[PDB]
Amino acid sequence: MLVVEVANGRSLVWGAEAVQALRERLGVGGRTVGALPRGPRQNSRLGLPLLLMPEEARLLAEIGAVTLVSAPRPDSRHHSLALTSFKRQQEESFQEQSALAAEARETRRQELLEKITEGQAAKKQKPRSALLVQLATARPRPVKARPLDWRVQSKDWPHAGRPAHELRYSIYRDLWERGFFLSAAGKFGGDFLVYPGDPLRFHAHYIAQCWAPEDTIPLQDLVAAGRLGTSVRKTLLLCSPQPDGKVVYTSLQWASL
Amino acid sequence: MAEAVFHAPKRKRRVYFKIFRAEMINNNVIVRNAEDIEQLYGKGYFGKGILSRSRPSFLQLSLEEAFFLVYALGCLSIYYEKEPLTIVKLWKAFTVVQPTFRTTYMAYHYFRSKGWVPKVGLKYGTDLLLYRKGPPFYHASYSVIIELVDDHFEGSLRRPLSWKSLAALSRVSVNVSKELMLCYLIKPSTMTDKEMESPECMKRIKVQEVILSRWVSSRERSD
Amino acid sequence: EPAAVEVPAGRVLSARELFAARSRSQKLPQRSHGPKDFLPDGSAAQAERLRRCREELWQLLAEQRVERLGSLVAAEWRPEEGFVELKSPAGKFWQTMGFSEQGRQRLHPEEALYLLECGSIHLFHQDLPLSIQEAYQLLLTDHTVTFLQYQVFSHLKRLGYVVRRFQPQPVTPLLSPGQASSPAVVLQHISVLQTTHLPDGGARLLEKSGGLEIIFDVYQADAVATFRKNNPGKPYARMCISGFDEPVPDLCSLKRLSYQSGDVPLIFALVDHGDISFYSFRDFTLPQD
Amino acid sequence: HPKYLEMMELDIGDATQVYVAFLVYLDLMESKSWHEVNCVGLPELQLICLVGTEIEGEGLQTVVPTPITASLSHNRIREILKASRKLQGDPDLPMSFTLAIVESDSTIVYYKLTDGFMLP
RNA sequence: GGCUCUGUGGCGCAAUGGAUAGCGCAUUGGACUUCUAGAGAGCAAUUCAAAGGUUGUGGGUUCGAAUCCCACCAGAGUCG
Ligand SMILES: [Mg+2]
Questions:
Q1: CATH number for the domain whose boundaries are A1-72+143-157
Q2: N or C: which end of chain C has fewer CB atoms below 10 A?
Q3: How far in angstroms lies nucleotide E67's C1' from the CA of residue A133?
Q4: Residue A253 beta carbon within 7 A of nucleic strand E
Q5: Where in the cell is it found (chain D)?
Q6: C-alpha angle A226-A232-A235 in degrees, rounded to nearest 5
């Protein structure tokens, strides 16, 4: 069982093991929005915080693997103990890092020995700033966060009860029951991208478009989405729930006539 | 006012008075005479081949093109099996056939009054295209969307635009090397919905082009 | 009340892990090494490639920002005033970020969060170093700065930009045979439709506010070497920030923001569950071809 | 024209859809050189359809002419899928049809809609 | 006039005593994808590789200095 701290309708995951479990077991990968430690000034590969979609959080909570908790707030009953523990930890890190740096310097000097000697012969004959601290991407302390109720609209979960979220959640659940991987497709003109497998190695084929049944479809939008899918080698796949507890799709393609 | 640039209109690697007459059949406009078709598609590139892709070398003018020809130029006179129609009746008939014809025709008139030859952007998912000097010579550079609003900027959205739709259209027009332009049409809010019956309301109408272009944050990093 | 969920403690690094982090190569492992497949046929080669890519991704995301406490300019988080106060003197980033008032070096919330992400500072709150999770929770609210706004700020700063917070029959055809002489003459006669621009008549809408407002001023990366805080000049583009779910800005919003911006290009900074989609509306006069 | 009145002899829908069907028939026959196209109708939805053969000896292919100025709710899409399946002779193949949208300039674009998933 | 900070490939930056001084954007080449009225475009139809240097100049410490220390050159902020 995992935890996904929710705040203002934003599901974020701050653990690497949580994302490892989500992508492998539950077939959900989400997106990364942080900054990479090993290079912060590039936008090619981003950091840890996993921006799970509202549907990706509701569904994972509705299957018994994710417990949506609300983001805690500062508690004044632990600050003194936290300060004492933090000071002890920083002193321990100071000592250990100093020792390790000294040993590393000694080892490298021994390795370069006799070369230092050759240099010195050819010549004569002729720590505070070093301390390292971690800017942790997740809380280093455990917190007691009240769980979240997602069936009743609230301030930390404004999604429940809205049509645009319920329809998308139904379509996401039905497309995820079939073992597909799913991801947002704002760039591609649709609400989802359907990958036959992990999106790392495999492309996607279907650019979903979560349309309500009675909602009118502007034919120009349909044509644009179909042509975009063609130009990306993907088939537009309309989706919509039905009152009889079933969802019907319609693979829209371009006939090369 | 950071007026958008005018990226050069690319060329095609390859290349290559008289009162007209059109017949309104089945709520659509048609042109039959041969020389009339030749002049209509050669001297302006109006309409599309009845069965061919572009030219009738084996002509059906869209609503906007036919109305432009009759009104802005006065060369074309649409008919209904016995009846030379008048510009007001054309406005009403084409609004009945398509409720959102006023907006599209006003945008078409604005763009074609600037020398650009526009065409339907059905294939790319838009309302109008813009071929410079004609379709054969230059690749169309602009894919046009059209809306309507009043001087207070409140009106009936002709085509609702979610960010999904704008992203899709921009990506398509980028992949086909085109610019996605919105052509918001602004009308006085104090104009009653009775002057719209006459076409002269355009003189009080105000256009506002907005080139919606993607901004790749990495390419615009320096100059 | 419902039971209390105990979120587990995050990852804590040791001396060996910290030193290994400081000896890291900044070579990014390639995303999905090799071209992308199109049909999962169950081939063991596909499974091996997937295993390789996944293990690389998990070894990458398990890395913690490690920095030396000689370049980690300390800072303090002041929620009452609503900024961050620097204890030690600032560094290179002070040529483009932060402001000085009352005689102290003070940082804005989003700027402080970005510096925390880049390892430039060591943010504190009540004498406790704030992690990036707690910094996201506190510094990003509906009062100080949103989450989408910080997302865009951090993106543009990572690319190397300078983003500074905003601080203000009876009816006849139009043409007759007697006026067809030159293409320009006709194209002007039948041009009764008068064009406008986003700011034209833009003064009377700032009262009709609500919804979308400009946020940042963007200076390109090249303008970072010689940047004057007091006299920075005309920015490259003023930034509005929205979401992919939120409605497209109406023409009212476009005119209002364009007037409130001036001769600076407008940019919108859409966010779609993490993706960033900097679309930019820009007035345009179609040349009389 | 024989087929023009054939579409217009069923008294279904409006004139615009009849003309759209005539255009789509003309295209699919005299441009793609399909083996044979036969007119159809659908009073259940005030709709018109065309059934033709892509290649001699192959199966049939439904067509659903549409003007761009007409809305299409996904429920209508399912209805037309079922109608086309009934027109296809009720085979085991997944339901499908053609959506040859038509503008007032006779421009035609074909986007076949198939029930379920269809890879590119 | 004093004080603080900055200077590394075209740009943003890492490395802050020892290997080949490296990462991204950018540029140039590979492979593939689409192009219907699009040589282009390519953003989970994307995916790879190369080349790119006055480390501000000068001097010093040291067996090696982009790493430390001084002199200055240019730049930014603050005070007065
Ligand atoms: Mg530089």
A1: 3.40.1170
A2: N
A3: 20
A4: no
A5: Nucleus; Nucleus, Nucleolus
A6: 40
